[PDB]
Structures are given as structure tokens and as C-alpha cells.
Ligand binder design. Sequence first.
Ligand SMILES: OC[C@H]1O[C@H](O)[C@H](O)[C@@H](O)[C@H]1O
Ligand SMILES: OC[C@H]1O[C@H](O)[C@H](O)[C@@H](O)[C@H]1O
Ligand code: NA
Lengths: 346, 340
Amino acid sequence: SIKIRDFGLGSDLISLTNKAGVTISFTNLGARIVDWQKDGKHLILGFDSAKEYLEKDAYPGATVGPTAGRIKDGLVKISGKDYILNQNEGPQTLHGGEESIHTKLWTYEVTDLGAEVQVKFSLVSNDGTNGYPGKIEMSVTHSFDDDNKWKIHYEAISDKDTVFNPTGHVYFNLNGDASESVENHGLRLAASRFVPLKDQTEIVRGDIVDIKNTDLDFRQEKQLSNAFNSNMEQVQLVKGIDHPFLLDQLGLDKEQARLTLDDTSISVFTDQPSIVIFTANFGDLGTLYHEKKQVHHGGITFQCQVSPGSEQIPELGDISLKAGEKYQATTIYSLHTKLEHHHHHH
Amino acid sequence: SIKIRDFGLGSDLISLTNKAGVTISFTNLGARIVDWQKDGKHLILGFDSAKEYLEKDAYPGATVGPTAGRIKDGLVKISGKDYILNQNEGPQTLHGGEESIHTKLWTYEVTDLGAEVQVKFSLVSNDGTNGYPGKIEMSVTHSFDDDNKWKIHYEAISDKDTVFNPTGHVYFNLNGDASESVENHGLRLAASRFVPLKDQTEIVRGDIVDIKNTDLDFRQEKQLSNAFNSNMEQVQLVKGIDHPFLLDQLGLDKEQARLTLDDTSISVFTDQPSIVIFTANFGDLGTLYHEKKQVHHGGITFQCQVSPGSEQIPELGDISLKAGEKYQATTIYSLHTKLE
Ligand SMILES: OC[C@H]1O[C@H](O)[C@H](O)[C@@H](O)[C@H]1O
Ligand SMILES: OC[C@H]1O[C@H](O)[C@H](O)[C@@H](O)[C@H]1O
Ligand code: NA
């Protein structure tokens, strides 16, 4: 079933329930996921109204871009030309600049396919918005089906050569309570290398490093606490994890990550080359989620995209988008129960 | 009473009915007026869903900007520097460029004051959007009261020196049917001068012309047909009226214009210096409103703003907006019914 209601400030809340009774909800403010529940438990972080996003933290569950992550000094080179983008984090351009796409009301249409329901959100980034050449016609389709798969499909076309590398900013917390650390979750991730950050400004260091057999090696499932407890320089730099992980094998067919807590698992599939993992390293900020004060490490993202820093590390990829060329990206989060035996204590 | 409903594509329709039983409706799509009706008759032109506006004509009833009207060559000078804005009508920038603020979903909040209800729409125009320096945080408040006054109050703040001169693009048609010309309405307008257009591109000619004792003098109420049957080359040029008229006396307290048909009249008040009057000179286009085929002359605007063309005729005014200055503008359309 599909239900809709005002969510505040003129945004709407679109709630879907599949045949298995799992419910998931989205808002056109930022073409964002608001909630995902199984048996009355929140599997992700979200707020109860649009205003909360605008006043507390506008990134959770949002579609972010046109470029996700940090761009050093807001500088990109487009078809031999240098362009300077809005700089919203010091000299850095973070998630497309200030008042970016995650803050706008997108228009949308819902398509009921029966075993699958699609919510296609649309928005036009005008030419020159935040320094980006355009215009860019974007669309984000979120869909949920009877097999418990939540899929995100991105599409975009630009009138001018530009750059495009958006992502979905959901935060998982299988505890269903923001005040509970995700250190008790087990994580498996098919990546042998990561991108280190230069310093507290979080721009990339410039090298790619092998993490096999370190506390950041999750090729084989391990508790997140192993990482959180680590004193590796990179962990200490950010007080948790806030880095791009380079997938070892590409392809939408491969389970690239799996996050488990007791009998519940979330599997990640994508056609993108990397996954930026940020573990809500907010310290004592304590943003309130459903009246629960969020704890340091009270959430984790799986931002699938071309890794940030390609400006400095060309090997990471090319996010340029030629005029008239159609961009597409697909990311899938799937829910499972009793996928494996995960019985731990923290 | 206030009623909010889905208007299509995620847009909302906010309808306000006052003590008098008069209903006005707006949508966040373009911070726009959709309908205005009395005793079941529409006073303005509008569609029945968000999609229609996007497919048929996105201007009707919308908030247009950041700059309303045509800018020659899309060129403006900001702090001695040339800036080229998005060009969407040949080399001109018309109504802020393509996919402008009238096509966006603005956020909004409703405030019920009892005799008066306000709907405050907000939108951020990012720095560089369509070539305009920013960011510009904008808000447009449409309000309706028990005195049948529909008011529009604009506010803006920019992080950088820029240009700003929006307008409301409602089209009136007291016939209540788009298939009927407005030639039968009577118009009164407190302006003795107008801004002639250069040619069919509709850019300004360069001069200011006295209209006293011409077919365009409405200082004294007269029927539209007059203007419409005039042989003045300017009328002939556009096949109707599509011009900025310069108001003789500035100030919000002066009734600047009045549109009348039978017992029903609309009065216009504004703090702006000019009123752009466009008479829906669409020829055979036949756009459909409520299933009625629009006729050439099937509507008329009162766009209050600084006259277009100030880029070439500085006397007209200056639309610049300095960083950190607060822009404000107010326009009111008041509805009256003679108890005959
Ligand atoms: O809160 C926004 C969040 O976005 C991503 O997760 C970044 O990597 C984090 O450093 C942080 O900036
Ligand atoms: O439909 C848009 C309309 O906008 C204004 O009123 C112009 O002056 C008209 O020439 C026309 O372009
Ligand atoms: Na809506």
C-alpha cells in the first residue's frame, strides 16, 4: 500500500508497505529516505518532520550532490577549464555547496507496479548553480519491492560538460535507537584498500593504502568495535571511520557490504567503485532522533559513489559528465533475516 | 477557512475562504495564485493541476524573477562588471531565464490571523543560478483578508551584490471565461507615460513617451476595446498592449489602477513605480483554461515592478541589490462589488 501526507513546510511523506509488512518512507525534501522499519523497529536514522531536518541535520537519508564529498578548494577542471564551486566548508566544497539539492523540494511521481513501487523525484540544477555548469536535469528513483529490496536509481543529463557524482546519505543503526552505538554490529566489506585523509580538513592525503590485516580490514566479518577501538592514525584522526573504501571487484551483482545485528542484515549492492563509510563521529553533539540523544558512533553510512579526491588522485576515477551524455548509477540495500549467526555481546 | 490539498507532482494547493465567502487559492509551485473566485465565478486565469502549468504555460499567477521582464542580450552590469544571465528568448533573458523560480516548489508556512491568513513561501536562489550572483534568500507572502484584499509582500537578502526585481504575473478576466475577450472591461490607470518597445523582440526602444490624450491614456476610465482598436504603431506592433506604464504618483496608498466589468471591480495598489500591462496577445494559440480555449486578449496583467529596460534607460530606475541590503516590495489587489 501507498500512503501520502504532508510532512511539513510543504514537503510530503510517501509511505510504502510491501507484502511482507515491511514499511519504508521518503520525502521530496532532498529526495530522501525518512524511515525503514521492520516489526516496529527503525533500521535507519531519521526525524519526524521536515523542519527537524532543516534545523538539526539536513544530510540524513538525503540525496546529495551534484558531487558527493569534499572537493579540495572547490576546484574542478572541466574540459580543460578550471571552475570554482561554492565553498561551504572552509575553502572546501562539501556535498555540492551550500543549500544544495538535499535542501530543495523535488517534484515527484509514484508508479505502482504491484510487487514494486517507484517514487521518481525530479529536479533541475540550473546552469551556474553553486558554480556548476548546467543546466542539469536530475532524477532519483527510489523503489521498494516485495523482496525487501530498496533501490536507488540516479539519472541525469546536462546541457553543458560538467561534473556529477551524487550519493545517498542514509545512516543505519540496527539498534533502532540513536543513543546506541553501532559498535555492536558486524560488518563485512569487499575492499582491500582505502583513501587516507590529509588532516582535520578531511581532504584526501594523495595516496591509496592497503588495509589488509589491519583493524580496517573487514573482508571477513568483524565487529565494528575493532575499528572504533583502533589507534591507527587514520582512526584517531577522525575519531572513527570517515573514509572511502575501494571495492575490490565491481559490479551490481556482487554483495559488496553486509551490516548485521543479531537476526537482521542489510546487504549493499552497487555499480559504483567505492563506498564512503562515516560512522557519525559527532562526539557529544547529541542530535535528537525520536527524542533519543544520538551517541558518538550512533550510525553508519554506505555512500556508494566514485571516491572523493579524484581531483588529486586520478586513479580513483573521472566524474566528468559530457553534455548530452546520460548519467546513471544504481545502488541497492537489501534487508534479510537470519542470514547468518550473529550472537555477540558488547 | 483553510484547506490544503495535493495539487499534483508533489505540489500543494492552499485555499483560503474568508468571511465573505470569497475563495483564493495558491500553490507552492512558483509561489503562485491559482484561483480567485466569487459566487462561483473565476476572476483570474488558472489551471486545475500542477501539470497543466508545466505543460501549458508556466507564467500565469506566478512569482517571476529574480528579474521580471526582458533583459536585452541577457546583459546586466554589477559593480561595473558585465554579467551574462541565462538567455531563454533569443539573446534576451526573459523572466529570469529558463527553469526559473516560477517552476520550483517553494517551501511554505501558513499563518492564520483570523481576519487575515498569510501564506509565506520561501526559496533560496543559489549563487550563480542562471548567471545571477547570490545566494538570494527570497520569500513571498501572499495574504487574503476579510476585506477581500489580496496582498503580496516580497522580501530578499543577497550574500552578494546582484539584481532583483520580481513581479506577480496574475492574469485577470472578469468574464470568468478565457474564451471571452477583456475588451469589454473598463480600465483606469494613473500613468501619463509609457515605455515603447523597439520591435517584435520586445526590447525597449530607448525612450519614454507621453501618452496623454492618446489611445493609451487611461487616466480616465475607458474601455479596453479602445486601446485594442487603436492604430497607434505601438498597439499595432504587439497586437494589443505589452508595455510598462509609468505611474504618476508613487506610494502604496494611491489606487493606481482599476479594472472594472459591471458590478465587479479590482483595484491595484503598489509601492513600485511601474505597471506592465500585457493583454494576452496570443493570437490563435488557444491555450485551454478549464476546458475553455483562450482567445487573443483573453486576459490582462498588472505586473507591478521597476520598469523593464533600465539597462538602457537609467531614468527608469535601478534594480541593483547590494550585499546585505534587505529588499521589500508590496502589491495589493483589492476586490469590490457594487451594491447597485
Ligand atoms: O555530516 C556530513 C557528513 O558527510 C559525509 O559523511 C562526510 O564524509 C562526513 O565527514 C560529514 O561531513
Ligand atoms: O507569457 C509571458 C509574457 O510575460 C510578460 O507579460 C511579457 O511582457 C509578455 O510579452 C509575455 O512574454
Ligand atoms: Na505536496
